[PDB]
Design an enzyme around this catalytic site. Sequence first.
Site, PDB file in Angstrom:
ATOM      1  N   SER A 120      -0.107  -5.701  -0.579  1.00 55.91           N
ATOM      2  CA  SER A 120       0.376  -5.591  -1.954  1.00 55.91           C
ATOM      3  C   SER A 120       0.443  -4.103  -2.292  1.00 55.91           C
ATOM      4  CB  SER A 120      -0.479  -6.387  -2.951  1.00 55.91           C
ATOM      5  OG  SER A 120      -1.846  -6.250  -2.671  1.00 55.91           O
ATOM      6  N   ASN A 124      -2.034  -1.557  -0.858  1.00 57.47           N
ATOM      7  CA  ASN A 124      -3.291  -2.179  -0.461  1.00 57.47           C
ATOM      8  C   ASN A 124      -3.252  -2.695   0.962  1.00 57.47           C
ATOM      9  OD1 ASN A 124      -3.089  -3.374  -3.704  1.00 57.47           O
ATOM     10  ND2 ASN A 124      -4.774  -2.035  -3.111  1.00 57.47           N
ATOM     11  N   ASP A 159      -3.904  -5.646   1.976  1.00 59.67           N
ATOM     12  CA  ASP A 159      -3.308  -6.978   2.050  1.00 59.67           C
ATOM     13  C   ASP A 159      -1.781  -6.935   1.952  1.00 59.67           C
ATOM     14  OD1 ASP A 159      -2.901  -6.344  -0.554  1.00 59.67           O
ATOM     15  OD2 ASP A 159      -3.824  -8.128  -1.450  1.00 59.67           O
ATOM     16  N   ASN A 170      -1.165  -4.497  -9.960  1.00 61.59           N
ATOM     17  CA  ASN A 170      -1.056  -5.035  -8.605  1.00 61.59           C
ATOM     18  C   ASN A 170       0.090  -6.033  -8.454  1.00 61.59           C
ATOM     19  OD1 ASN A 170      -2.315  -7.138  -6.351  1.00 61.59           O
ATOM     20  ND2 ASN A 170      -2.955  -5.002  -6.036  1.00 61.59           N
ATOM     21  N   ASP A 187      -0.125  -1.339  -5.791  1.00 59.19           N
ATOM     22  CA  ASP A 187      -0.437  -1.059  -7.178  1.00 59.19           C
ATOM     23  C   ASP A 187       0.537  -0.016  -7.727  1.00 59.19           C
ATOM     24  OD1 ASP A 187      -2.732  -2.456  -6.283  1.00 59.19           O
ATOM     25  OD2 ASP A 187      -3.998  -0.670  -6.474  1.00 59.19           O
ATOM     26  N   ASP A 201      -7.454 -12.071 -18.408  1.00 62.01           N
ATOM     27  CA  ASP A 201      -7.478 -13.075 -17.333  1.00 62.01           C
ATOM     28  C   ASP A 201      -8.842 -13.747 -17.201  1.00 62.01           C
ATOM     29  OD1 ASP A 201      -6.845 -13.418 -13.840  1.00 62.01           O
ATOM     30  OD2 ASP A 201      -5.622 -14.235 -15.488  1.00 62.01           O
TER      31      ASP A 201
END
Length: 129
Positions: free
Chosen positions: A50, A46, A48, A59, A52, A101
């Site tokens: 990060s 990603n 940012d 993630n 996946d 979540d």
Amino acid sequence: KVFGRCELAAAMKRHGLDNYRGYSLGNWVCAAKFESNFNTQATNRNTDGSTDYGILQINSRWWCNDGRTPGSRNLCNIPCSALLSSDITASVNCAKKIVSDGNGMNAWVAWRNRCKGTDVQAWIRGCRL
Ligand SMILES: CCCCCCCCCCCCOS(=O)(=O)O
């Protein structure tokens, strides 16, 4: 490993993912297809920083440790590499934590963009389940 459509459904459904949290098998399979194309080894980094991982592209910002996502969390207590195994168990288990979540399966952006509100029953069409 690159799962067949019906094989994956059976595994998914073997692991208690059918109807989990309300989402029928077709839902989880549809997501797999469009997240990883059924490839337990897919990775995608990603913007940012990060990444996946896995059949369901879980993630590293929240659910897994990969050692390169500063400030991230590791909520399903697991190394992100476990998400790449031929055995989808860890993925499913963590999927169950993500999906609970609060936003349901919206956590998987590609499920809501390509699966949600579709005839997700077709993804398991013809499978001996
Ligand atoms: C800079 C490296 C970051 C890599 C990706 C994920 C981070 C894992 C850190 C553990 C936080 C512990 O999370 S816990 O909720 O399970 O206790």
